[PDB]
Design a protein around this ligand. Structure first.
Ligand SMILES: *Cc1c(COP(=O)(O)O)cnc(C)c1O
Ligand SMILES: *Cc1c(COP(=O)(O)O)cnc(C)c1O
Ligand SMILES: [Cl-]
Ligand SMILES: [Cl-]
Ligand SMILES: [Cl-]
Ligand SMILES: [Cl-]
Ligand SMILES: [Mg+2]
Ligand SMILES: [Mg+2]
Ligand SMILES: [Mg+2]
Ligand SMILES: [Mg+2]
Lengths: 360, 356
């Protein structure tokens, strides 16, 4: 039929082969004559999937053997409270770097549970940049330092990660995990809802330094202890089996295209197509982020006034573009260009942008 | 290539629901995207989300003063979320123990507050549901918690107690929407979807609105989810889509009364087989408490038990091993398990007994 270009911000485009693979075996997985959704998570067919998803992640991000990979329910949002529940102990401080709205939501949950601090923030200038690491106010009693690697709503992204030795570095990488190579040992824990760059909603990937958190925390509900899930290999209670399966399929696809290094090359190219369009528009389109902080995953911009914003977004939607409206809290536009968004979608968006500009 | 899916959780689903999912997996509702590729704030997703709630409301006849929530974390997270929200200081989380899942729920409440056992059949290894006249209730109960179907032990509430001093709360994971319900008896009902309603990944919570909060994490307040219509954060969109599909199948076959007829025939096939076996097969549950959802039984000794389960597996039956905590055999016959599978089981049971 007509064209559809999927710029949804979360859940988002999946790579076609992962969906085609799921479709073909939806009723009969691994010759069992059952859907993967109808299997016991204690079945060997399921355990294979569960283990493969872990091994693919391990290989793709080169995760060290002293880290474990958890598959949890509850979204990144549940991790906002689970993290301080496990690590924010009395006399310690949950230290946060604020670089957007998702950083503020993380902070707020820690405030419910303990002492917090703000190491650095670009909130005053509306989160157009990542603060300089030299500006980080660190405390000797910090339980951890928490960052948001990619600020989904504001379109900014860490180019690199701070060296932190006094506390574990924790990162919400929901919207850029496995979009590029990562030195995992810079961190004590990384978490990501899968629905932005790794597959479906319903599972949250948590990569954790085992010794930071494989120990029981007194007074914490069993389901809310990392230790519980580490010990049981994310099989303490029933896992989201279809979500983990789809995650596996998506990871297989990333591996098939050459891994993190190859997908970074693709992601830089798609992003360049859109930012060059903005940058050659003589101010018709204005990116929110400062150039040194531009996200490769979420491209945020405005036209010169809200009327043009609305006409542009209405024209997009009529031409088959999905998800370009900015987050409700900030307005404007947001082109989400996660791993699986195809480059011709990006070219199509550029075409749209240029004709709208020329005809305005 | 004959397979009979008696898995206990996750479990068989209706073929029409899975076929419908397969057909539109790449192109949902002519959007040219998977349901999995939609924003949860899209109208496209929002209609599915609402349709799943609407179907549950219709099928269980849920009154207007109840809200239907779709949460992550399984029934296991509800074990702690419930007392987190309702077990206020100077109140008591009161539990009726009818199996190991009851025990797991009570354990989480003990972390957070005062608990109590209203009644328990544990001493007799959970062969029955206690008499309601036996319950020990307290003026300051925050709630009375029960497990409607005791998945590991194969017993089930025939009816529910009339409780007015505190909200009645029920873990219905393994029998929700297997029969009509009087939802007004309860302040809250919860269930992982993965037994009777859908795939794993979503938990259905039916809650009396005005029943349910300083200092509880945002994600763990029922009020968060009630206020946001279970769209506070990203829901498990595909699981809710599949739940809708399963609910459409139940509606299409005639609703809660119709599925109860099927379920009672399924259970009748197995229990009759056991009762007519002259002691070769022995059911764990007392007759009066027999579950329609999980049929638990053993052969006369461990070696015959093992021989039977081996023969079963060879013949294409899946999931019949009993829970590791109790051994024996367990035939889970949730909504989507077809009558033909239970007939096959019967015939295998009869042949095995003849050939022993
Ligand atoms: C989407 C998003 C979240 C929210 O994830 P949920 O799974 O909806 O809780 C949190 N952090 C970031 C950076 C996000 O982009
Ligand atoms: C399966 C089951 C549970 C566990 O559900 P999860 O989704 O695995 O947490 C809890 N209670 C009962 C009665 C069950 O049958
Ligand atoms: Cl943000
Ligand atoms: Cl977002
Ligand atoms: Cl039980
Ligand atoms: Cl069980
Ligand atoms: Mg491959
Ligand atoms: Mg193309
Ligand atoms: Mg219909
Ligand atoms: Mg008879």
């Amino acid at each position: 039929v007509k064209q559809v270009f999927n710029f949804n911000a979360g859940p988002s485009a999946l790579p076609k082969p992962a969906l085609e693979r799921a479709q073909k075996e939806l009723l009969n997985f691994n010759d069992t004559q059952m859907s993967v959704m109808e299997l016991s998570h204690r079945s060997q067919s399921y355990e294979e999937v569960h283990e493969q998803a872990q091994n693919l992640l391990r290989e793709l991000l080169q995760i060290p053997n002293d880290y474990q990979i958890l598959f949890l329910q509850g979204g990144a949002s549940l991790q906002f409270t689970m993290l301080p529940m496990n690590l924010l102990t009395k006399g310690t401080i949950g230290n946060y770097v604020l670089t957007g709205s998702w950083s503020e939501k993380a902070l707020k949950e820690a405030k419910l549970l303990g002492e917090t601090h703000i190491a650095a923030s670009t909130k005053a200038n509306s989160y157009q940049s990542i603060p300089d690491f030299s500006e980080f106010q660190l405390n000797e009693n910090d339980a951890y330092l928490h960052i948001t690697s990619n600020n989904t709503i504001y379109g900014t992204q860490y180019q690199n990660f701070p060296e932190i030795n006094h506390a574990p570095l924790i990162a919400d990488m929901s919207s850029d995990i496995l979009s590029r190579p990562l030195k995992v040992n810079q961190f004590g824990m990384i978490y990501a809802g899968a629905q932005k760059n790794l597959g479906p909603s319903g599972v949250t990937v948590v990569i954790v330094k085992k010794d930071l958190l494989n120990t029981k925390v007194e007074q914490v509900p069993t389901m809310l202890q990392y230790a519980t899930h580490i010990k049981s290999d994310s099989l303490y209670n029933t896992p989201p089996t279809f979500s983990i399966y789809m995650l596996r399929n998506v990871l297989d696809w990333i591996k098939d295209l050459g891994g993190a290094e190859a997908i970074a090359k693709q992601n830089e190219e798609k992003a360049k197509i859109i930012y060059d369009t903005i940058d050659e528009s003589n101010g018709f389109y204005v990116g929110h982020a400062e150039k040194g902080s531009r996200s490769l995953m979420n491209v945020t911009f405005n036209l010169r006034n809200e009327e043009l914003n609305q006409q542009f977004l209405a024209k997009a939607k009529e031409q088959g573009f999905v998800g370009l409206n900015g987050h409700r809290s900030v307005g404007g536009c947001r082109a989400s260009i996660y791993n699986a968004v195809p480059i011709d979608a990006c070219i199509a968006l550029r075409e749209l942008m240029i004709q709208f500009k020329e005809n305005a």
